[PDB]
Amino acid sequence: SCDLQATNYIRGCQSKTYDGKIFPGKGGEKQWICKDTIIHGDTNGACIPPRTQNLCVGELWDKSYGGRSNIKQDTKELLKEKIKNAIHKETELLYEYHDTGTAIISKNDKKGQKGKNDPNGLPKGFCHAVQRSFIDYKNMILGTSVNIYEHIGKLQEDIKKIIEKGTPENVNAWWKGIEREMWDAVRCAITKINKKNNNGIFNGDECGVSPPTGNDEDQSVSWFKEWGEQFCIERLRYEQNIREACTICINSKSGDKIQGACKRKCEKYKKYISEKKQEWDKQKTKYENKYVGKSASDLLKENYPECISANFDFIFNDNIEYKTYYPYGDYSSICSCEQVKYYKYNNAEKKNNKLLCYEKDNDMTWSKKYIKKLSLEGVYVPPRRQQLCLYELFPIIIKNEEGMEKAKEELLETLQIVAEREAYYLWKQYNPTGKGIDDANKKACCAIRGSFYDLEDIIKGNDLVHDEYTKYIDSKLNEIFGSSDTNDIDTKRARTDWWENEPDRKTIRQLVWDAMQSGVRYAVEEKNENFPLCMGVEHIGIAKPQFIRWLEEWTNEFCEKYTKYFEDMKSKCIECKKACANYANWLNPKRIEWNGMSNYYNKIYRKSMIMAPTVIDYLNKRCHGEINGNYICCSCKNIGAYQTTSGTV
């Protein structure tokens, strides 16, 4: 039902070149620009996409010399028609650009041209590109600190004139009203491809009925999502190339090194990351400042299915020790000739790389983020759970795609390493934290047991947090252990069985516990101290449900930190006003956490009663008196009986 210019020539609006020229052409590739420019201005932590830099402005602006708007002597309907034509031509141009398979987004990860098409007959990436382009029209018609073209700012103020001299900021409103008719330029130009196609039916609603959503309205995030889609899409291409040269590595050195095409393919990725890190580092900092509590890594992992195998924390690391140990980061384990093996405590010669997890932060807070789907709302994640030493597990899981024996073989020895390192580092955190010596390690033997159980729940697939790491680990373990033929029920029982049982008499649950004693043995050896009794136990009691374990962790901590604050405030009791400000500053997020945590307890037990005691009651038995280094791990100066009055209103 549109009479708008179909086989139209908009001046200056020719075929796209941002991702390079369409063959037989070659080059003209525009690059992401993140820094401030004389041409574009302040980006403000943002990176301008090449797709943006090639926007079809056509008759609205002229690039000849400095660049000037033609819009000066235009009317309101004249200006709308121009925007409508420009938008319509940009979709047409973006059809060709993707149908040719020139746009990085329109590329495949292995299969040349084969399988790079969505449900409809529209090329891979066409809709995303068109959607993004539409947002750029919106932001260009309104006010933006980034100038897509050299002097285009002039156009935005001239637009003001037209809209101010019309029937009724006013333009922020004019776009609001005009936007539907502007999006229909996208839909009606999509209808045109059907006429071109034979038995390939089109109607326009294939890229959506309405113009891009709420989240995307923010140029900054629309551009960041594109950066993400492209990074992931390119990253899987670097993967395939590493996999064609490494699984399909010659020990040259004095020892096991990659040297041929494998070194070449891995270095190509190592170089790729070295480049893309600045763009990430910038856009991460700016996004997360614009959206508190929101994670960059999430905005991407959600929207783009190619990002599933991606872990930005591991790819884009600031840790020097990591950068050398994992030189290819993400694909390090694949780009390594070195045999995946955990070395037992008094194994002659060769020792494990206790190649540090990040420095465990004591100042860290509890979190309701990265929590599992199924409600589970109310539960808080402990800080020492958040500082999990399961980093080594991520590259090795990426390595083994075919989840056969080798996958679960390599995972087992990597589990033992992860287990050793965590235990090593926890001792170094909790022993310098403890009061007495026979109390410092008594406090340490529990953080260890906690993590042993949490590490256990992760593998068993019983854990309550699918974070930057554990999310893909759950997905891959379900791949490795369960088939499509066997439901989740057998899959849960597959992981639980692998861990619980097993050459030697030792089980996978046992080898992980043995490995944890080894880490404490090296930690205590360093300080020339004696290995504790709480750590020397062949067996660890059956883990309590994670929620209840974590609820005890919360309570033990609160009790200590309360008797710290309240006591050091009362002692100082004006100067109290600053002590009160601190005590209350700490306590306010505790009230939020206690309500949530104690509410869950009742939902899972007490409420529809059911022969279960109260939250306080349970914790009263659990925290009365001194600590034990095994399953008796909570202590309070005053029993929880007062805590609900302390933590409410």
Numbering used by the authors: 1218 to 1385, 1399 to 1478, 1486 to 1491, 1494 to 1613, 1618 to 1745, 1751 to 1821, 1836 to 1870, 1882 to 1922
What's written in the study?
The structure was solved and refined at 2.9 Å resolution. The polypeptide chain of the refined structure could be traced from S1218 to V1922 with gaps Q1386-T1398 (DBL3X), N1479-K1485 (DBL3X), G1492-Q1493 (DBL3X), E1614-R1617 (DBL4ε), A1746-G1750 (DBL4ε), D1822-N1835 (DBL4ε), N1871-S1881 (DBL4ε) and N1923-M1950 (DBL4ε). Both domains display the helical secondary structure and the pattern of canonical cysteines characterizing the DBL motif. The double domain forms a compact structure with a short linker (interdomain) region connecting the two DBL modules. The DBL3X-DBL4ε interface is extensive and includes 18 polar interactions between residues that are largely conserved in sequence. A total surface accessible area of 1340 Å2 is buried at the interface between DBL3X and DBL4ε. Subdomain 2 contains the conserved four-helix bundle (αH2, αH3, αH4 and αH5) but, unlike other DBL domains, αH5 possesses an 11-residue insertion (N1744-K1754). In DBL4ε-FCR3, however, the interval between the conserved tryptophan residues comprises 18 amino acids (WWX18W), of which 11 form a loop with no regular secondary structure.
Pregnancy-associated malaria (PAM) results from the accumulation of PEs in the placenta via attachment to the glycosaminoglycan chondroitin sulphate A (CSA) present in the intervillous spaces. The extracellular region of VAR2CSA comprises six DBL domains (type ε or unknown (X)) and a CIDR (CIDRpam) module arranged in the following configuration: DBL1X-DBL2X-CIDRpam-DBL3X-DBL4ε-DBL5ε-DBL6ε.
